[PDB]
Amino acid sequence: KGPKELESINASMKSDIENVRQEVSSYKEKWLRDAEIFGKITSIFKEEL
Amino acid sequence: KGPKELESINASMKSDIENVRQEVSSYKEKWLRDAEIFGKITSIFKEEL
Protein backbone atom coordinates (compact mmCIF):
# COMPACT_ATOMS: atom_id res chain seq x y z
CA LYS A 1 0.00 0.00 0.00
CA GLY A 2 1.16 3.60 -0.54
CA PRO A 3 2.89 5.08 2.52
CA LYS A 4 0.58 8.10 2.30
CA GLU A 5 -2.32 5.59 2.24
CA LEU A 6 -0.79 3.71 5.19
CA GLU A 7 -0.28 6.98 7.11
CA SER A 8 -3.94 7.92 6.57
CA ILE A 9 -5.28 4.55 7.77
CA ASN A 10 -2.92 4.54 10.78
CA ALA A 11 -4.00 8.06 11.76
CA SER A 12 -7.69 7.13 11.46
CA MET A 13 -7.29 3.94 13.46
CA LYS A 14 -5.63 5.91 16.25
CA SER A 15 -8.50 8.41 16.39
CA ASP A 16 -10.96 5.51 16.34
CA ILE A 17 -9.18 3.95 19.32
CA GLU A 18 -9.60 7.26 21.14
CA ASN A 19 -13.30 7.78 20.47
CA VAL A 20 -13.76 4.20 21.73
CA ARG A 21 -12.15 4.74 25.15
CA GLN A 22 -14.41 7.71 25.91
CA GLU A 23 -17.53 5.96 24.65
CA VAL A 24 -16.84 2.82 26.73
CA SER A 25 -16.18 4.82 29.90
CA SER A 26 -19.39 6.87 29.49
CA TYR A 27 -21.50 3.77 28.81
CA LYS A 28 -20.04 2.02 31.86
CA GLU A 29 -20.75 5.02 34.15
CA LYS A 30 -24.37 5.47 33.04
CA TRP A 31 -24.97 1.73 33.34
CA LEU A 32 -23.47 1.75 36.89
CA ARG A 33 -25.67 4.62 38.15
CA ASP A 34 -28.77 2.93 36.78
CA ALA A 35 -27.55 -0.37 38.31
CA GLU A 36 -27.12 1.14 41.82
CA ILE A 37 -30.67 2.48 41.81
CA PHE A 38 -31.92 -0.86 40.47
CA GLY A 39 -29.98 -2.74 43.22
CA LYS A 40 -31.41 -0.73 46.09
CA ILE A 41 -34.91 -1.44 44.83
CA THR A 42 -33.90 -5.12 44.19
CA SER A 43 -32.66 -5.50 47.84
CA ILE A 44 -35.91 -4.96 49.86
CA PHE A 45 -37.94 -6.89 47.25
CA LYS A 46 -35.22 -9.64 47.26
CA GLU A 47 -35.56 -9.94 51.08
CA GLU A 48 -39.34 -10.21 50.53
CA LEU A 49 -38.76 -13.03 47.95
CA LYS B 1 -80.88 -35.78 20.25
CA GLY B 2 -83.10 -37.96 22.46
CA PRO B 3 -84.80 -36.00 25.27
CA LYS B 4 -83.51 -38.58 27.76
CA GLU B 5 -80.04 -37.97 26.26
CA LEU B 6 -80.57 -34.20 26.47
CA GLU B 7 -81.77 -34.49 30.09
CA SER B 8 -78.65 -36.48 31.01
CA ILE B 9 -76.24 -33.98 29.43
CA ASN B 10 -78.09 -31.02 30.97
CA ALA B 11 -77.44 -32.63 34.33
CA SER B 12 -73.73 -32.81 33.25
CA MET B 13 -73.82 -29.41 31.42
CA LYS B 14 -75.21 -27.79 34.59
CA SER B 15 -72.38 -29.53 36.46
CA ASP B 16 -69.89 -28.04 33.93
CA ILE B 17 -71.41 -24.54 34.47
CA GLU B 18 -70.92 -25.06 38.23
CA ASN B 19 -67.31 -26.10 37.50
CA VAL B 20 -66.93 -22.85 35.46
CA ARG B 21 -68.25 -20.83 38.45
CA GLN B 22 -65.70 -22.63 40.67
CA GLU B 23 -63.00 -21.76 38.08
CA VAL B 24 -64.11 -18.07 38.20
CA SER B 25 -63.72 -18.23 41.99
CA SER B 26 -60.24 -19.73 41.46
CA TYR B 27 -59.40 -16.89 39.01
CA LYS B 28 -60.51 -14.35 41.66
CA GLU B 29 -58.19 -16.11 44.16
CA LYS B 30 -55.41 -15.89 41.55
CA TRP B 31 -56.19 -12.14 41.20
CA LEU B 32 -55.89 -11.78 45.02
CA ARG B 33 -52.48 -13.53 44.91
CA ASP B 34 -51.56 -11.16 42.05
CA ALA B 35 -52.64 -8.23 44.30
CA GLU B 36 -50.35 -9.46 47.12
CA ILE B 37 -47.61 -9.61 44.46
CA PHE B 38 -48.62 -6.02 43.44
CA GLY B 39 -48.26 -4.82 47.05
CA LYS B 40 -44.64 -6.09 47.04
CA ILE B 41 -44.49 -4.50 43.57
CA THR B 42 -45.56 -1.32 45.49
CA SER B 43 -42.10 -0.74 47.11
CA ILE B 44 -40.56 -0.99 43.61
CA PHE B 45 -43.28 1.45 42.39
CA LYS B 46 -42.31 3.94 45.16
CA GLU B 47 -38.65 3.64 44.07
CA GLU B 48 -39.81 4.26 40.44
CA LEU B 49 -41.79 7.39 41.48
Binding site: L32, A35, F38, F45, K46, L49 | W31, I44
Partner: peptide, 29 residues
Protein backbone atom coordinates in the same frame (compact mmCIF):
# COMPACT_ATOMS: atom_id res chain seq x y z
CA UNK C 1 -55.70 -16.40 34.45
CA UNK C 2 -53.58 -14.48 31.91
CA UNK C 3 -53.44 -11.56 34.39
CA UNK C 4 -52.30 -13.99 37.16
CA UNK C 5 -49.62 -15.37 34.80
CA UNK C 6 -48.51 -11.75 34.13
CA UNK C 7 -48.21 -11.17 37.91
CA UNK C 8 -46.07 -14.34 38.08
CA UNK C 9 -44.02 -12.89 35.17
CA UNK C 10 -43.49 -9.59 37.07
CA UNK C 11 -42.25 -11.59 40.08
CA UNK C 12 -39.90 -13.56 37.78
CA UNK C 13 -39.00 -10.15 36.29
CA UNK C 14 -37.97 -9.22 39.85
CA UNK C 15 -35.80 -12.38 40.03
CA UNK C 16 -34.25 -11.39 36.67
CA UNK C 17 -33.63 -7.89 38.13
CA UNK C 18 -31.91 -9.42 41.22
CA UNK C 19 -29.75 -11.56 38.92
CA UNK C 20 -28.96 -8.32 37.02
CA UNK C 21 -27.93 -6.63 40.31
CA UNK C 22 -25.58 -9.57 41.06
CA UNK C 23 -24.20 -9.20 37.50
CA UNK C 24 -23.63 -5.43 38.06
CA UNK C 25 -21.73 -6.26 41.25
CA UNK C 26 -19.65 -8.67 39.13
CA UNK C 27 -19.33 -5.38 35.92
CA UNK C 28 -18.19 -3.46 39.04
CA UNK C 29 -15.01 -5.60 39.09
Amino acid sequence: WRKEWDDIEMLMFGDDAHSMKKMIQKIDS
